[PDB]
Amino acid sequence: LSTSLSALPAAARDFVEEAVRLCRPREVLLCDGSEEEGKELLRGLQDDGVLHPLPKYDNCWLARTDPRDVARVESKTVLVTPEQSDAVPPPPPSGGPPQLGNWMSPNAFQAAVQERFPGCMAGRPLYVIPFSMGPPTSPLAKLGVQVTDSPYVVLSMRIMTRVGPAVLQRLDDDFVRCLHSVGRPLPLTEPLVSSWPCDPSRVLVAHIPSERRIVSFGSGYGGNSLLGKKCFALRIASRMAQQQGWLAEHMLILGVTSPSGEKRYMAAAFPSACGKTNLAMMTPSLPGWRIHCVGDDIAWMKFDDEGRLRAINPERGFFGVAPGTSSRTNPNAMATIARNTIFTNVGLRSDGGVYWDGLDEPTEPGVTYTSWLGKPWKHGDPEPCAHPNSRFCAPADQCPIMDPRWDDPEGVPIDAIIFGGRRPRGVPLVVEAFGWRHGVFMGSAMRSEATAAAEHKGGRLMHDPFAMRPFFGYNAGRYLEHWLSTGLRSNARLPRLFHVNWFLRDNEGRFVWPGFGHNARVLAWIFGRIQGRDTARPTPIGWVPKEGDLDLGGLPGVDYSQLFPMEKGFWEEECRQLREYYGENFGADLPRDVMAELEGLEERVRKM
Ligand SMILES: Nc1nc2c(ncn2[C@@H]2O[C@H](COP(=O)(O)OP(=O)(O)O)[C@@H](O)[C@H]2O)c(=O)[nH]1
Ligand SMILES: [Mn+2]
Numbered sequence: 001l002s003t004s005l006s007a008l009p010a011a012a013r014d015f016v017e018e019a020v021r022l023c024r025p026r027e028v029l030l031c032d033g034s035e036e037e038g039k040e041l042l043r044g045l046q047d048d049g050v051l052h053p054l055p056k057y058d059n060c061w062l063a064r065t066d067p068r069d070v071a072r073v074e075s076k077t078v079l080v081t082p083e084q085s086d087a088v089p090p091p092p093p094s095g096g097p098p099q100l101g102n103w104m105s106p107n108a109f110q111a112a113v114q115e116r117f118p119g120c121m122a123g124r125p126l127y128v129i130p131f132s133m134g135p136p137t138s139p140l141a142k143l144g145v146q147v148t149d150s151p152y153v154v155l156s157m158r159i160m161t162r163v164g165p166a167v168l169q170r171l172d173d174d175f176v177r178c179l180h181s182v183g184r185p186l187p188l189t190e191p192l193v194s195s196w197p198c199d200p201s202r203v204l205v206a207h208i209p210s211e212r213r214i215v216s217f218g219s220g221y222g223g224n225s226l227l228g229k230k231c232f233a234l235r236i237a238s239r240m241a242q243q244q245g246w247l248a249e250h251m252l253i254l255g256v257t258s259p260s261g262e263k264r265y266m267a268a269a270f271p272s273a274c275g276k277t278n279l280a281m282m283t284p285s286l287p288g289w290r291i292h293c294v295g296d297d298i299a300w301m302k303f304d305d306e307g308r309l310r311a312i313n314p315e316r317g318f319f320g321v322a323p324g325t326s327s328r329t330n331p332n333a334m335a336t337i338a339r340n341t342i343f344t345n346v347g348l349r350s351d352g353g354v355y356w357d358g359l360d361e362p363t364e365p366g367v368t369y370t371s372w373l374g375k376p377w378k379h380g381d382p383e384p385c386a387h388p389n390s391r392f393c394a395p396a397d398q399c400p401i402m403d404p405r406w407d408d409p410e411g412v413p414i415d416a417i418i419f420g421g422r423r424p425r426g427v428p429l430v431v432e433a434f435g436w437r438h439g440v441f442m443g444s445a446m447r448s449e450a451t452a453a454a455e456h457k458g459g460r461l462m463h464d465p466f467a468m469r470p471f472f473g474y475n476a477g478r479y480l481e482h483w484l485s486t487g488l489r490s491n492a493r494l495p496r497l498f499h500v501n502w503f504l505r506d507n508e509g510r511f512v513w514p515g516f517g518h519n520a521r522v523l524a525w526i527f528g529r530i531q532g533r534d535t536a537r538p539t540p541i542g543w544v545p546k547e548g549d550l551d552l553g554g555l556p557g558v559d560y561s562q563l564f565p566m567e568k569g570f571w572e573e574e575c576r577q578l579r580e581y582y583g584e585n586f587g588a589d590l591p592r593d594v595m596a597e598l599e600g601l602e603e604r605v606r607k608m
């Protein structure tokens, strides 16, 4: 932290000064990303009562938030473009709410800003965060400057991005302008809940691609406040990617090593809270196999001149869902979060440790709990001890399984792309596409039960094409056409496309597939298919593994038949819904090739 801004280059200084003019902070501080800075930020937050120490561990901290500020708010997230059609497909003719992004005009946006931001930082410091996405480096690392009035956001940005001296030395005219405020100028007129500043009814997370700008107001929660992450690395970047010949995707990246010692890399698009983190740092239940983590959330991908799809992880940390994490489900996450980690909305134990449903950290008898509400909690209570969307925020270099190449500027070559979401019935454990166009169709057709990561009724089955529904930075029809065109790249070594489902439910009423480390059995088959092994049989929906080429050894309770349902009625209904969905939400912006693939599916279904 410093009061000198002189280290900022001209363009960055200009942006900071106009943000200072608008918001009227009490003082202005440049962040340097240092250890001493981190300590001073931690102390200040403990004073404010925002952070609580966790003495059981090494430099770990707990925040509790206002119950209204616990997740992303998709209905208050907008794309600001001169023309609506650049942001979103035609508004649904039946008049329902848009499902592929919310357009806001530049004029509506300017008005919205003038109603929220003037004097919003009164009595608060404005922190200047120069940051880099990817090694700074690299390239193609992309740099940004985030201003914020929240020390919590500063600390989280320091974990999740590179901040900020090697960043300062590279920073020029070329950068994202990220403006954030929790939107609670001092003095307060009404009290905070859990010392957590936020303005729920006034929340606005805006993206202005043509200005290389993000403007976020009223929320301190991760997806709304860590502007390099979803806002920049997905929304702004996907628009940049489309015009520059690359891809910015909601995808984990991992390395798989086979018993033969062969290593391949795979990307996987799952919706939020649908298994990316647990897969990316999985400990395989097949000991002849090895997994390495590259990233758990965002992938930037570009074909090299070898025609290979190269992927980097632009992030520096993990912002992972805590509930469910244990030495059974994710022992690699357990090792990662043991030190230098900020927890949000998890339980506090009387022994100075943390708690959530699933955690199996050895605890003494008579240990008591306080919930994310900050109130005493007991095994048996109506609600969970930890919020369903509670988080850990930990630096990636503390993961014991990081791929030797995880911060390699060149990227890793991708041989498989995997789509998947939560589907309780009908959709098999694993399917391989018949080819590129078909796999793009499968991606577009993705549906997944809503989770606690945003404002949707948990359990509601929702379309989520490419797991990108909340994160499109431009017209989703054009995004599909971009994916189609990508596969037409001359001499491209295309990855194979797959669709998985970890979440089929049995009768009754558990999960059919044990998942977690056992997902290595699926990845093994996928790797086999990459190697070109004759291990698949065709179905109306794509290739599936032959029974006997999918390793179910040591899973006596698990039946192949339940993993691979193939019911005509289900798929007839699915086609009907897809037809309805595309028509309402994509309209004329739906690529012909996607409709052609739907017609292909309906035709294969006719044969059943
Ligand atoms: N049943 C089951 N649950 C899983 C699996 N993988 C992850 N989960 C759970 O789903 C929730 C979200 O997991 P996570 O990997 O963090 O999702 P992400 O946000 O997509 O990275 C957590 O509570 C996990 O325990 C799986 O293979 N099977
Ligand atoms: Mn995500």
Ligand SMILES: [Mn+2]
Binding pocket: 273, 277, 319, 320, 321
């Ligand atoms: Mn997660």
